[PDB]
Amino acid sequence: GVEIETISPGDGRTFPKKGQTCVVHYTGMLQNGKKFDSSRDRNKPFKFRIGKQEVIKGFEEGAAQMSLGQRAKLTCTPDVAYGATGHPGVIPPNATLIFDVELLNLE
């Protein structure tokens, strides 16, 4: 499940398509716990493309429901991120994920 809660401003028309590369300042958060990832540290704003399953599913579908300039707030259920597996050492199994996401894309 993906549940968008948008911090408003953007344009409401510019949506990503297939094979397009988008620029995201993602900022993870575990529920009732501290951070686990950011791109604000590295200042390397994570140019990835759409439809190649490179990111996880819950992060991928939430970028499709955003526009240029928007600043969403994802909430990924465990079944679409790691919840049976668990990333070893960083994300425990059966974990709910939160993502502060800004989309200032190109293309």
Side-chain angles (χ1 to χ4, degrees), residues 11 13-24 45-55 59-60 63-68 103-107:
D11 57 351
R13 65 184 183 272
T14 304
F15 288 166
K17 294 182 179 181
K18 294 180 181 180
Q20 292 180 354
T21 299
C22 58
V23 171
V24 174
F46 189 63
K47 295 182 179 181
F48 76 104
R49 64 182 295 165
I50 307 299
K52 300 298 184 292
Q53 296 178 356
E54 294 179 354
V55 301
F59 185 79
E60 188 175 1
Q65 297 178 358
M66 292 179 69
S67 180
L68 169 61
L103 178 59
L104 295 174
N105 59 0
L106 296 176
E107 294 179 353

mmCIF file of all heavy atoms in Angstrom, residues 11 13-24 45-55 59-60 63-68 103-107:
data_model
loop_
_atom_site.group_PDB
_atom_site.id
_atom_site.type_symbol
_atom_site.label_atom_id
_atom_site.label_comp_id
_atom_site.label_asym_id
_atom_site.label_seq_id
_atom_site.Cartn_x
_atom_site.Cartn_y
_atom_site.Cartn_z
ATOM 1 N N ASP A 11 2.933 21.717 -10.032
ATOM 2 C CA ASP A 11 2.057 22.204 -11.092
ATOM 3 C C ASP A 11 0.822 21.350 -11.331
ATOM 4 O O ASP A 11 -0.139 21.854 -11.922
ATOM 5 C CB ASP A 11 2.821 22.358 -12.413
ATOM 6 C CG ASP A 11 3.475 21.076 -12.869
ATOM 7 O OD1 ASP A 11 3.499 20.096 -12.098
ATOM 8 O OD2 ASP A 11 3.958 21.055 -14.018
ATOM 9 N N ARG A 13 0.365 18.904 -13.395
ATOM 10 C CA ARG A 13 0.227 18.395 -14.752
ATOM 11 C C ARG A 13 1.423 17.602 -15.251
ATOM 12 O O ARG A 13 1.242 16.756 -16.135
ATOM 13 C CB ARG A 13 -0.040 19.548 -15.735
ATOM 14 C CG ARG A 13 1.111 20.531 -15.876
ATOM 15 C CD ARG A 13 0.762 21.696 -16.779
ATOM 16 N NE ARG A 13 1.909 22.580 -16.951
ATOM 17 C CZ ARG A 13 2.195 23.594 -16.143
ATOM 18 N NH1 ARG A 13 1.406 23.865 -15.112
ATOM 19 N NH2 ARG A 13 3.262 24.345 -16.371
ATOM 20 N N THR A 14 2.621 17.816 -14.717
ATOM 21 C CA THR A 14 3.826 17.214 -15.278
ATOM 22 C C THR A 14 4.048 15.887 -14.574
ATOM 23 O O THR A 14 4.527 15.842 -13.441
ATOM 24 C CB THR A 14 5.022 18.143 -15.121
ATOM 25 O OG1 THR A 14 4.725 19.402 -15.735
ATOM 26 C CG2 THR A 14 6.242 17.551 -15.795
ATOM 27 N N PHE A 15 3.694 14.810 -15.241
ATOM 28 C CA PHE A 15 3.827 13.500 -14.640
ATOM 29 C C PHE A 15 4.921 12.701 -15.338
ATOM 30 O O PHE A 15 5.169 12.890 -16.534
ATOM 31 C CB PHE A 15 2.507 12.721 -14.705
ATOM 32 C CG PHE A 15 1.441 13.238 -13.777
ATOM 33 C CD1 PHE A 15 0.124 12.837 -13.934
ATOM 34 C CD2 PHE A 15 1.750 14.109 -12.746
ATOM 35 C CE1 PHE A 15 -0.862 13.299 -13.084
ATOM 36 C CE2 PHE A 15 0.772 14.573 -11.894
ATOM 37 C CZ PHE A 15 -0.536 14.168 -12.063
ATOM 38 N N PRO A 16 5.611 11.822 -14.617
ATOM 39 C CA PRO A 16 6.625 10.984 -15.259
ATOM 40 C C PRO A 16 5.998 9.907 -16.128
ATOM 41 O O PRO A 16 4.888 9.432 -15.875
ATOM 42 C CB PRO A 16 7.377 10.366 -14.074
ATOM 43 C CG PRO A 16 7.100 11.282 -12.929
ATOM 44 C CD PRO A 16 5.703 11.764 -13.149
ATOM 45 N N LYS A 17 6.729 9.521 -17.167
ATOM 46 C CA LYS A 17 6.290 8.506 -18.112
ATOM 47 C C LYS A 17 7.291 7.355 -18.132
ATOM 48 O O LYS A 17 8.215 7.290 -17.319
ATOM 49 C CB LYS A 17 6.106 9.107 -19.504
ATOM 50 C CG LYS A 17 4.978 10.109 -19.593
ATOM 51 C CD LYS A 17 4.814 10.625 -21.007
ATOM 52 C CE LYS A 17 3.666 11.611 -21.091
ATOM 53 N NZ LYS A 17 3.472 12.115 -22.474
ATOM 54 N N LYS A 18 7.093 6.439 -19.076
ATOM 55 C CA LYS A 18 7.971 5.286 -19.202
ATOM 56 C C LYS A 18 9.336 5.707 -19.728
ATOM 57 O O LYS A 18 9.443 6.540 -20.631
ATOM 58 C CB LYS A 18 7.355 4.254 -20.141
ATOM 59 C CG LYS A 18 6.086 3.617 -19.616
ATOM 60 C CD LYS A 18 5.544 2.601 -20.605
ATOM 61 C CE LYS A 18 4.258 1.978 -20.097
ATOM 62 N NZ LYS A 18 3.701 0.981 -21.050
ATOM 63 N N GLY A 19 10.382 5.125 -19.147
ATOM 64 C CA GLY A 19 11.733 5.377 -19.605
ATOM 65 C C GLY A 19 12.272 6.752 -19.293
ATOM 66 O O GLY A 19 13.258 7.170 -19.902
ATOM 67 N N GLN A 20 11.655 7.471 -18.364
ATOM 68 C CA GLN A 20 12.102 8.802 -17.989
ATOM 69 C C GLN A 20 12.881 8.733 -16.685
ATOM 70 O O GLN A 20 12.582 7.912 -15.813
ATOM 71 C CB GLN A 20 10.917 9.754 -17.849
ATOM 72 C CG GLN A 20 10.218 10.056 -19.156
ATOM 73 C CD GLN A 20 9.049 10.996 -18.979
ATOM 74 O OE1 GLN A 20 8.688 11.346 -17.859
ATOM 75 N NE2 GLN A 20 8.460 11.425 -20.088
ATOM 76 N N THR A 21 13.885 9.592 -16.562
ATOM 77 C CA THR A 21 14.754 9.627 -15.395
ATOM 78 C C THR A 21 14.372 10.803 -14.510
ATOM 79 O O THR A 21 14.300 11.943 -14.979
ATOM 80 C CB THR A 21 16.219 9.726 -15.814
ATOM 81 O OG1 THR A 21 16.569 8.574 -16.592
ATOM 82 C CG2 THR A 21 17.125 9.805 -14.596
ATOM 83 N N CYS A 22 14.130 10.523 -13.234
ATOM 84 C CA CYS A 22 13.640 11.514 -12.294
ATOM 85 C C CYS A 22 14.631 11.717 -11.156
ATOM 86 O O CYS A 22 15.379 10.807 -10.786
ATOM 87 C CB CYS A 22 12.284 11.099 -11.741
ATOM 88 S SG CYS A 22 12.332 9.506 -10.941
ATOM 89 N N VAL A 23 14.613 12.924 -10.602
ATOM 90 C CA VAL A 23 15.595 13.389 -9.632
ATOM 91 C C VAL A 23 14.887 13.617 -8.306
ATOM 92 O O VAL A 23 14.002 14.473 -8.204
ATOM 93 C CB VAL A 23 16.287 14.665 -10.125
ATOM 94 C CG1 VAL A 23 17.124 15.265 -9.040
ATOM 95 C CG2 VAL A 23 17.137 14.357 -11.339
ATOM 96 N N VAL A 24 15.282 12.852 -7.291
ATOM 97 C CA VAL A 24 14.537 12.718 -6.045
ATOM 98 C C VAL A 24 15.477 12.966 -4.873
ATOM 99 O O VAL A 24 16.550 12.362 -4.799
ATOM 100 C CB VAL A 24 13.905 11.317 -5.928
ATOM 101 C CG1 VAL A 24 13.258 11.129 -4.581
ATOM 102 C CG2 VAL A 24 12.893 11.083 -7.024
ATOM 103 N N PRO A 45 21.493 13.539 -5.996
ATOM 104 C CA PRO A 45 20.041 13.376 -5.867
ATOM 105 C C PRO A 45 19.411 12.260 -6.686
ATOM 106 O O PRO A 45 18.311 12.454 -7.207
ATOM 107 C CB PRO A 45 19.514 14.736 -6.330
ATOM 108 C CG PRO A 45 20.688 15.660 -6.283
ATOM 109 C CD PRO A 45 21.845 14.816 -6.627
ATOM 110 N N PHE A 46 20.081 11.107 -6.773
ATOM 111 C CA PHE A 46 19.507 9.784 -7.051
ATOM 112 C C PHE A 46 18.698 9.742 -8.355
ATOM 113 O O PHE A 46 17.477 9.598 -8.372
ATOM 114 C CB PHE A 46 18.687 9.328 -5.840
ATOM 115 C CG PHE A 46 18.224 7.907 -5.923
ATOM 116 C CD1 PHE A 46 19.150 6.869 -5.969
ATOM 117 C CD2 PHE A 46 16.877 7.601 -5.882
ATOM 118 C CE1 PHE A 46 18.738 5.550 -6.029
ATOM 119 C CE2 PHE A 46 16.451 6.290 -5.935
ATOM 120 C CZ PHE A 46 17.383 5.258 -6.006
ATOM 121 N N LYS A 47 19.420 9.902 -9.457
ATOM 122 C CA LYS A 47 18.815 9.861 -10.786
ATOM 123 C C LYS A 47 18.497 8.414 -11.150
ATOM 124 O O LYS A 47 19.380 7.664 -11.564
ATOM 125 C CB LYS A 47 19.757 10.480 -11.812
ATOM 126 C CG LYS A 47 20.004 11.958 -11.607
ATOM 127 C CD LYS A 47 20.917 12.524 -12.682
ATOM 128 C CE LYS A 47 21.144 14.012 -12.472
ATOM 129 N NZ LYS A 47 22.015 14.600 -13.525
ATOM 130 N N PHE A 48 17.234 8.014 -11.021
ATOM 131 C CA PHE A 48 16.813 6.686 -11.441
ATOM 132 C C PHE A 48 15.686 6.802 -12.460
ATOM 133 O O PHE A 48 15.036 7.843 -12.587
ATOM 134 C CB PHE A 48 16.366 5.828 -10.250
ATOM 135 C CG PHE A 48 15.010 6.174 -9.710
ATOM 136 C CD1 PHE A 48 13.919 5.361 -9.983
ATOM 137 C CD2 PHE A 48 14.842 7.254 -8.867
ATOM 138 C CE1 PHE A 48 12.668 5.643 -9.478
ATOM 139 C CE2 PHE A 48 13.597 7.544 -8.350
ATOM 140 C CZ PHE A 48 12.503 6.735 -8.660
ATOM 141 N N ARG A 49 15.453 5.712 -13.179
ATOM 142 C CA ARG A 49 14.467 5.667 -14.245
ATOM 143 C C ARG A 49 13.261 4.839 -13.825
ATOM 144 O O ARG A 49 13.276 4.131 -12.817
ATOM 145 C CB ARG A 49 15.083 5.099 -15.523
ATOM 146 C CG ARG A 49 15.524 3.664 -15.392
ATOM 147 C CD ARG A 49 16.153 3.203 -16.682
ATOM 148 N NE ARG A 49 15.167 3.188 -17.755
ATOM 149 C CZ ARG A 49 15.467 3.112 -19.045
ATOM 150 N NH1 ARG A 49 16.732 3.038 -19.432
ATOM 151 N NH2 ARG A 49 14.497 3.109 -19.948
ATOM 152 N N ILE A 50 12.211 4.923 -14.637
ATOM 153 C CA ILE A 50 10.897 4.393 -14.296
ATOM 154 C C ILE A 50 10.680 3.081 -15.037
ATOM 155 O O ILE A 50 10.972 2.981 -16.235
ATOM 156 C CB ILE A 50 9.794 5.406 -14.644
ATOM 157 C CG1 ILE A 50 10.101 6.764 -14.020
ATOM 158 C CG2 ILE A 50 8.442 4.925 -14.148
ATOM 159 C CD1 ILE A 50 10.180 6.749 -12.514
ATOM 160 N N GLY A 51 10.170 2.078 -14.327
ATOM 161 C CA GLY A 51 9.732 0.849 -14.952
ATOM 162 C C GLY A 51 10.786 -0.219 -15.109
ATOM 163 O O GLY A 51 10.604 -1.129 -15.924
ATOM 164 N N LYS A 52 11.884 -0.143 -14.363
ATOM 165 C CA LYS A 52 12.932 -1.148 -14.449
ATOM 166 C C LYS A 52 13.116 -1.900 -13.142
ATOM 167 O O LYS A 52 14.073 -2.675 -13.023
ATOM 168 C CB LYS A 52 14.249 -0.506 -14.878
ATOM 169 C CG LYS A 52 14.141 0.161 -16.221
ATOM 170 C CD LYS A 52 13.808 -0.854 -17.289
ATOM 171 C CE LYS A 52 13.791 -0.206 -18.648
ATOM 172 N NZ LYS A 52 12.652 0.743 -18.746
ATOM 173 N N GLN A 53 12.231 -1.665 -12.166
ATOM 174 C CA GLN A 53 12.211 -2.338 -10.863
ATOM 175 C C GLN A 53 13.515 -2.150 -10.096
ATOM 176 O O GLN A 53 13.923 -3.016 -9.322
ATOM 177 C CB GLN A 53 11.874 -3.824 -11.008
ATOM 178 C CG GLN A 53 10.480 -4.065 -11.545
ATOM 179 C CD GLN A 53 10.180 -5.531 -11.727
ATOM 180 O OE1 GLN A 53 11.045 -6.379 -11.525
ATOM 181 N NE2 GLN A 53 8.948 -5.840 -12.105
ATOM 182 N N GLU A 54 14.175 -1.013 -10.312
ATOM 183 C CA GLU A 54 15.434 -0.744 -9.635
ATOM 184 C C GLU A 54 15.195 -0.332 -8.194
ATOM 185 O O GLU A 54 15.882 -0.805 -7.285
ATOM 186 C CB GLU A 54 16.210 0.331 -10.391
ATOM 187 C CG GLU A 54 16.651 -0.121 -11.772
ATOM 188 C CD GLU A 54 17.396 0.954 -12.527
ATOM 189 O OE1 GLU A 54 17.475 2.092 -12.021
ATOM 190 O OE2 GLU A 54 17.898 0.661 -13.630
ATOM 191 N N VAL A 55 14.234 0.556 -7.966
ATOM 192 C CA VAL A 55 13.777 0.857 -6.618
ATOM 193 C C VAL A 55 12.747 -0.186 -6.220
ATOM 194 O O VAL A 55 12.331 -1.008 -7.042
ATOM 195 C CB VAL A 55 13.200 2.276 -6.513
ATOM 196 C CG1 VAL A 55 14.241 3.296 -6.916
ATOM 197 C CG2 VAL A 55 11.987 2.399 -7.376
ATOM 198 N N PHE A 59 8.099 2.547 -3.268
ATOM 199 C CA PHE A 59 8.711 3.817 -3.625
ATOM 200 C C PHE A 59 8.445 4.162 -5.080
ATOM 201 O O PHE A 59 8.426 5.342 -5.444
ATOM 202 C CB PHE A 59 10.216 3.760 -3.363
ATOM 203 C CG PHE A 59 10.927 5.063 -3.579
ATOM 204 C CD1 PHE A 59 10.885 6.060 -2.619
ATOM 205 C CD2 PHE A 59 11.645 5.288 -4.744
ATOM 206 C CE1 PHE A 59 11.546 7.257 -2.816
ATOM 207 C CE2 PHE A 59 12.303 6.483 -4.949
ATOM 208 C CZ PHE A 59 12.253 7.468 -3.984
ATOM 209 N N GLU A 60 8.226 3.149 -5.915
ATOM 210 C CA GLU A 60 8.121 3.366 -7.351
ATOM 211 C C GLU A 60 6.755 3.905 -7.738
ATOM 212 O O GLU A 60 6.657 4.844 -8.536
ATOM 213 C CB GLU A 60 8.402 2.062 -8.086
ATOM 214 C CG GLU A 60 8.505 2.200 -9.581
ATOM 215 C CD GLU A 60 8.899 0.900 -10.246
ATOM 216 O OE1 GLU A 60 9.062 -0.109 -9.529
ATOM 217 O OE2 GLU A 60 9.051 0.888 -11.486
ATOM 218 N N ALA A 63 5.992 7.635 -6.811
ATOM 219 C CA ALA A 63 6.548 8.674 -7.668
ATOM 220 C C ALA A 63 5.693 8.885 -8.906
ATOM 221 O O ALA A 63 5.753 9.953 -9.525
ATOM 222 C CB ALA A 63 7.980 8.323 -8.066
ATOM 223 N N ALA A 64 4.900 7.881 -9.284
ATOM 224 C CA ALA A 64 4.005 8.033 -10.424
ATOM 225 C C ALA A 64 2.825 8.934 -10.094
ATOM 226 O O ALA A 64 2.271 9.579 -10.988
ATOM 227 C CB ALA A 64 3.512 6.664 -10.887
ATOM 228 N N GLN A 65 2.434 8.997 -8.823
ATOM 229 C CA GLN A 65 1.303 9.801 -8.394
ATOM 230 C C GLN A 65 1.714 11.196 -7.950
ATOM 231 O O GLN A 65 0.950 11.862 -7.248
ATOM 232 C CB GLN A 65 0.556 9.089 -7.265
ATOM 233 C CG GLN A 65 -0.040 7.753 -7.678
ATOM 234 C CD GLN A 65 -0.743 7.042 -6.540
ATOM 235 O OE1 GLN A 65 -0.756 7.520 -5.410
ATOM 236 N NE2 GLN A 65 -1.329 5.889 -6.834
ATOM 237 N N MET A 66 2.902 11.649 -8.337
ATOM 238 C CA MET A 66 3.394 12.974 -7.998
ATOM 239 C C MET A 66 3.616 13.789 -9.261
ATOM 240 O O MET A 66 3.644 13.261 -10.373
ATOM 241 C CB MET A 66 4.710 12.904 -7.219
ATOM 242 C CG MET A 66 4.613 12.330 -5.831
ATOM 243 S SD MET A 66 6.252 12.291 -5.095
ATOM 244 C CE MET A 66 6.543 14.045 -4.883
ATOM 245 N N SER A 67 3.816 15.088 -9.069
ATOM 246 C CA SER A 67 4.150 15.993 -10.154
ATOM 247 C C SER A 67 5.457 16.700 -9.834
ATOM 248 O O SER A 67 5.997 16.568 -8.733
ATOM 249 C CB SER A 67 3.038 17.017 -10.394
ATOM 250 O OG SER A 67 3.383 17.879 -11.463
ATOM 251 N N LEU A 68 5.968 17.437 -10.821
ATOM 252 C CA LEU A 68 7.164 18.252 -10.630
ATOM 253 C C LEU A 68 6.945 19.301 -9.557
ATOM 254 O O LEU A 68 5.974 20.058 -9.600
ATOM 255 C CB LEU A 68 7.563 18.938 -11.935
ATOM 256 C CG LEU A 68 8.632 20.038 -11.845
ATOM 257 C CD1 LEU A 68 9.963 19.541 -11.315
ATOM 258 C CD2 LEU A 68 8.830 20.685 -13.198
ATOM 259 N N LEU A 103 10.214 15.620 -5.420
ATOM 260 C CA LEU A 103 10.442 15.302 -6.824
ATOM 261 C C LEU A 103 10.698 16.598 -7.580
ATOM 262 O O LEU A 103 9.765 17.341 -7.895
ATOM 263 C CB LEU A 103 9.258 14.542 -7.404
ATOM 264 C CG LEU A 103 9.351 14.188 -8.883
ATOM 265 C CD1 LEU A 103 10.568 13.340 -9.141
ATOM 266 C CD2 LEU A 103 8.099 13.454 -9.293
ATOM 267 N N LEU A 104 11.966 16.876 -7.861
ATOM 268 C CA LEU A 104 12.349 17.941 -8.782
ATOM 269 C C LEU A 104 13.049 17.260 -9.943
ATOM 270 O O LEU A 104 14.275 17.249 -10.016
ATOM 271 C CB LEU A 104 13.240 18.925 -8.129
ATOM 272 C CG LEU A 104 12.675 19.750 -6.985
ATOM 273 C CD1 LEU A 104 13.798 20.565 -6.378
ATOM 274 C CD2 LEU A 104 11.567 20.654 -7.483
ATOM 275 N N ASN A 105 12.265 16.730 -10.873
ATOM 276 C CA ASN A 105 12.828 15.855 -11.883
ATOM 277 C C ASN A 105 13.386 16.649 -13.055
ATOM 278 O O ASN A 105 13.331 17.880 -13.101
ATOM 279 C CB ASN A 105 11.794 14.830 -12.358
ATOM 280 C CG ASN A 105 10.526 15.463 -12.951
ATOM 281 O OD1 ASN A 105 10.377 16.683 -13.026
ATOM 282 N ND2 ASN A 105 9.614 14.607 -13.395
ATOM 283 N N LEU A 106 13.933 15.918 -14.017
ATOM 284 C CA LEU A 106 14.225 16.453 -15.335
ATOM 285 C C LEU A 106 13.549 15.542 -16.347
ATOM 286 O O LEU A 106 12.768 14.668 -15.951
ATOM 287 C CB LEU A 106 15.730 16.541 -15.571
ATOM 288 C CG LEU A 106 16.476 17.513 -14.652
ATOM 289 C CD1 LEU A 106 17.972 17.449 -14.904
ATOM 290 C CD2 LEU A 106 15.959 18.928 -14.832
ATOM 291 N N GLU A 107 13.850 15.739 -17.632
ATOM 292 C CA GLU A 107 13.242 15.025 -18.764
ATOM 293 C C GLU A 107 11.716 15.114 -18.763
ATOM 294 O O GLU A 107 11.035 14.226 -18.250
ATOM 295 C CB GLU A 107 13.673 13.552 -18.791
ATOM 296 C CG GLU A 107 15.147 13.327 -19.068
ATOM 297 C CD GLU A 107 15.520 11.857 -19.060
ATOM 298 O OE1 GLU A 107 14.658 11.022 -18.707
ATOM 299 O OE2 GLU A 107 16.674 11.536 -19.408
#
